[PDB]
Assembly symmetry: C3
Homo-oligomer: 164 residues x 3
């Protein structure tokens, strides 16, 4: 008796990748044509990485690197949707499911708007939730800072977890 | 008892003008803020935190800068609309917390005024609203006084 | 009932041979410039707690104009924040923080930070998350001009 119930947890992820050569970027599982790619060991999906770290952070499980180190061949080159699904499983094992997530793509270019709803659908599938539990938005910094100078893209993500 | 989290981040550049508007307060200043609306970075970030928590997108979806009807819009009115459509979806405000990231002007004399206006627009008590301000120690675009940034977070509760 | 808060703090590097983060002394080619001991991480956590509780920010409670707090241990400042948040009726549910720094390497120090933070917050270690990341040499953190921290907190009614 007298156990904890209906507990909730907050997490926040902030990720950055710099532009490099390529013909597209990948955000939220969606390939977006662009004259640069993002520099990364795999697909450079800044949005899914930030969401992953928000989930792990809420669960006090560290960050992606703690669970998928580069020394581990299993996850070498892994698709970031597959990584996110593995994060969801780890967090579930610890007793937590997703209540909702909200994320902000900080990018001067390309435009994110036409891709947002597709991202929401894929993220919701990977998180095991309804689309109404997932929000993605975007903003520029009005040509200020490293995102404004088109040097890279940043994402802020927050997550609220609920006890399973 | 269900709840939702949201986060908003907004930036506006300085431009010509004699005041800025933050949290509904007009602060005399050497520059204004450039924006389609009145440029209230703080109310924009709060609006996006609320829309984000309710999975309703962002303020640019609801009040596009391609629509001249929203030119110079009072961001308090935009925020009140956000509160209304969040309520329609079944949520009210639990609490909000925001950080103004600005090298200048000093926000301190205006914080409590901002809290009262924000609480009124959100339909909550002043104790459910926190506003704070910080500098970046003259680093980065806010430190060079190129613009102002705001981070806001919101927790929604079931109506 | 629960409450959300967020803190963001930045300090610039200055001449020195260590920094203090999460209560831990980390050797470095520079120090951090600050009125206090410069612990960006504890400052951001303090502001997330105060923000959630609608108690303002840490400068309201420990003004930089007061010489008595010059060089102050940011853990002691945090312990006071925890006490006044409790007096208002709130305790910590969990916190999550991100150190944004190109250097020094934070990884060897994180578990030590979590232990000190959890003690100061009056919670278990499994209620405290700290992670570190770079901006891939972009921006003022990428140019090694300073360190930033983002922290979020969820408070629970006492
Ligand atoms: N890279 C970006 C940046 C912003 N946007 C969208 O543009 C609108 C206005 O953004 P700004 O306020 O940054 O101009 C928002 O609705 C935002 O989601 C976008 O679709 N792609
Ligand atoms: N633009 C700003 C920036 C900070 N401040 C206040 O100054 C104090 C210290 O902030 P800094 O250490 O960032 O200078 C804080 O309490 C903050 O509320 C302000 O009143 N206006
Ligand atoms: N200042 C820093 C930045 C990152 N890190 C470590 O580097 C890992 C990967 O971070 P980046 O992707 O930012 O390089 C983190 O999970 C953390 O263990 C660190 O230990 N100190
Ligand atoms: Mg990444
Ligand atoms: Mg705006
Ligand atoms: Mg500080």
């Amino acid at each position: 008796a007298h156990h904890h119930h209906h507990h909730m947890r907050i997490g926040h992820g902030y990720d950055v990748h710099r532009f490099g050569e390529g013909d597209f970027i990948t955000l939220g599982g969606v390939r977006i044509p662009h004259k640069h790619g993002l520099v990364a060991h795999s697909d450079g999906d800044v949005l899914l990485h930030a969401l992953s770290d928000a989930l792990l952070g809420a669960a006090a499980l560290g960050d992606i690197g703690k669970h998928f180190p580069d020394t581990d061949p299993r996850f070498k080159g892994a698709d970031s949707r597959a990584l996110l699904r593995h994060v969801v499983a780890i967090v579930a094992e610890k007793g937590w499911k997703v209540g909702n997530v909200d994320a902000t793509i900080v990018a001067q270019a390309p435009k994110m708007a036409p891709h947002i709803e597709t991202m929401r659908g894929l993220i919701a599938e990977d998180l095991g939730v309804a689309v109404d539990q997932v929000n993605v938005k975007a903003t520029t910094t009005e040509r200020l800072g490293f995102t404004g100078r088109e040097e890279g893209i940043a994402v802020h993500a927050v997550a609220l977890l609920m006890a399973r």
